Amino acid sequence: RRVDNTSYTDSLSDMFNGLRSISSSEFVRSVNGRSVFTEGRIDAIKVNM
Amino acid sequence: CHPTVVYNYLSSRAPNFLRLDDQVSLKLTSAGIGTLMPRPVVQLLDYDL
């Protein structure tokens, strides 16, 4: 589908963008030597293939 | 008519189990303002003759 003046997207991609991106950094987060994960849970698309 | 139209026509004609080739679809759907192309028509004759 047409998004704006010069760009298009596609229902699958369009759905992928709807996901929250968790900074690379936040994954390797650590506190006093122990890795910790303060972030929530990873928004994801489940593909039953 | 505008290419967009051609797409909608050809693509809705696609019989069961088929789709209009991509590249064709894209070139047609990507056309901008002011572009035009001939209307597709189904040519049927008067067999009885």
Q: What is the 3-state secondary structure (H, E, C) of B13-49?
A: HCCCCCCCCHHHHHHHHHCCCCCCCCCCCCCCCCCCC
Residue A8 in contact with residue A2, Cβ under 8 Å? Answer: yes
Residues of A within 8 A of B30 (CB-CB) are 8
Q: What is the distance, to the nearest Å, from the Cα of residue B34 to the centroid of all Cα atoms in its chain? A: 18
Q: Rounded to an integer, what distance in angstroms lies between the CA atom of residue A10 and that of residue B22?
A: 13
- Specified resolution (Å): 3.5
Residue B6 in contact with residue B39, Cβ under 8 Å? Answer: yes
Residue with tokens 């070139």: B27
Judge whether B30 is closer than 8 Å to chain A, CB to CB: yes
Q: Rounded to an integer, what distance in angstroms lies between the CA atom of residue A24 and that of residue B3?
A: 43
Q: Rounded to an integer, what distance in angstroms lies between the CA atom of residue A23 and that of residue B18?
A: 41
C-alpha distances (whole Å) from B47 to each of A1, A26, A29, B43, B44 are 42, 73, 78, 12, 8
